[PDB]
Design a protein around this ligand. Structure first.
Ligand SMILES: CCOP(=S)(OCC)Oc1cnc2ccccc2n1
Length: 117
């Protein structure tokens, strides 16, 4: 059993920046990969980034050069550094973790990011 808790969203102006946290608890030593997803109003959830235990990162075209995913194994936390923020980045951001040799998956509760004014 792995649980994920998110924090760090909020309201920011276009051009601002935010860091989102994804704190994992439970059998975190079985986690294989972690990823960040977002769900815009009225849209399917969308893959954003992915990171392995070793630190290899993968990104979608929509956030390449603007968002950064990292992980701190000492704290069981995965971060999403959201920079160069556009109004189109307004969404609920979700983190996930694949564990037990990628057989199971856990999701965070989501955190709202609003880019306005
Ligand atoms: C949401 C938290 O994700 P992370 S930092 O994994 C990102 C891939 O979880 C952890 C934490 N400790 C670990 C120790 C050994 C092996 C894997 C671990 N994964």
């Amino acid at each position: 059993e792995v649980q994920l808790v998110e924090s760090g969203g909020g309201l920011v102006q276009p051009g601002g920046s935010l860091r989102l946290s994804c704190v994992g608890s439970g059998r975190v030593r079985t986690i294989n990969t972690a990823g960040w997803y977002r769900q815009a109003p009225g849209q399917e959830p969308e893959f954003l980034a992915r990171i392995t235990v070793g630190g290899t990162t993968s990104y979608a075209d929509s956030v390449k050069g603007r968002f950064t995913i990292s992980r701190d194994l000492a704290k069981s936390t995965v971060y999403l550094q959201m920079d160069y923020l556009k109004p189109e980045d307004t969404a609920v951001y979700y983190c996930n973790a694949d564990f037990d040799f990628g057989s199971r998956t856990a999701w965070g509760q989501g955190t709202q990011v609003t880019v306005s004014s």
